[PDB]
Symmetry: C3
Subunit: 150 residues, 3 copies
């Protein structure tokens, strides 16, 4: 099985930045009524998509008291739970984060370790890369993710 997910969030100055379940020091952060964790959102969508379960707007809306205000990791674990109940075993996750600031390189180890712990995958099965948009999207964080299961 395969899944593909994408997520993007406007960035505003002085908001906290969350990626891969972590708080990342940054002059900018997700402007939205989520934590705007683009990384986990794309990953979550990718998991749901692999089983035709819908997407995070459908399963985790802020109109539901279960899900409103929850950390994005909560959604991810939920999606993990759902596809495992259908037989899924997650084997690999590869994703790309695009944002003109801040620099994520110094946070590489922590981000990869977090995804490893939240996805329960070995580090060599976590494919994380960092890019800038070269000014094509200087006010947004974008994530695109592919997952492979059994």
């Amino acid at each position: 099985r395969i899944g593909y997910g994408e997520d993007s969030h406007r960035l505003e100055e002085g908001r906290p930045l969350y990626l891969c379940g972590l708080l990342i020091p940054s002059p900018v952060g997700a402007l939205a009524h989520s934590d705007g964790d683009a990384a986990l959102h794309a990953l979550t969508d990718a998991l749901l998509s692999a089983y035709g379960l819908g997407d995070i707007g459908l399963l985790f809306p802020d109109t539901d008291p279960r899900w409103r205000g929850e950390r994005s990791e909560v959604f991810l674990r939920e999606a993990l739970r759902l596809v495992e109940a259908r037989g899924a075993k997650l084997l690999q996750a590869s994703l790309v984060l695009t944002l003109d600031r801040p620099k994520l390189g110094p946070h590489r180890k922590a981000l990869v370790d977090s995804l490893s712990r939240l996805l329960r995958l070995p580090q060599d099965r976590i494919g994380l890369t960092f890019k800038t948009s070269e000014g094509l999207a200087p006010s947004h964080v974008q994530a695109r993710a592919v997952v492979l299961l059994d």
Copy 2:
């Protein structure tokens, strides 16, 4: 075998929106020489790409007189015709549709069914997720797709 494809079109008011082979209610439809069915196009390119066959610009360049107008379903099924002729069996398709308006929630089941129909795949092997552009691309519809075969 895997394939990856993308498509986008400018959106315009008073225009007809086709998505996944359906006519959808919106202020805007695609500004294209075709029906601008970004979902079907991305999927066609992903299929062609999985066998190195080219892309829709190549195989469907309108100048031929049996492409003018034609529905994008024609393109999709020809691509299906070609990979199966090369021994392929399509197993799964996972795509993301990006568009600020209109909202695709109310058309989700119909959209899946159609892809189920056209791709001759089971519901749980059609991974369709919907996203907004967050102001990055307010005037376009975007689709990106991955396919898995054999």
Copy 3:
């Protein structure tokens, strides 16, 4: 094993365009401290991602005398070395190139031949499709790639 990678570079008028390791006659070329080869960069990242080796910003920075000034194909070959020393066997690459000008169609055979040579894959396992941004990104070249190994 699967890997997903992206790259995008600003296009400037008057600068040389390099795609898939080839010089492409064009009014625009990447404005980069590299050769701005979006195609090879996204492929390189996808390969590294498949083994969690990091990304080209990490492995091939211009801070490092061996990599500074080098053609992008040099990085791609090193990434192929790295994953093959981890036992990988590249099976397939599928990428999409997006740019508003120039037209890549007349160059398709050469670009595909370049990638089959560089990746050591037969042409039917090189999936290359060409798109414009429909005016969404008219000053950039964008590349997104999926790789499959073993």
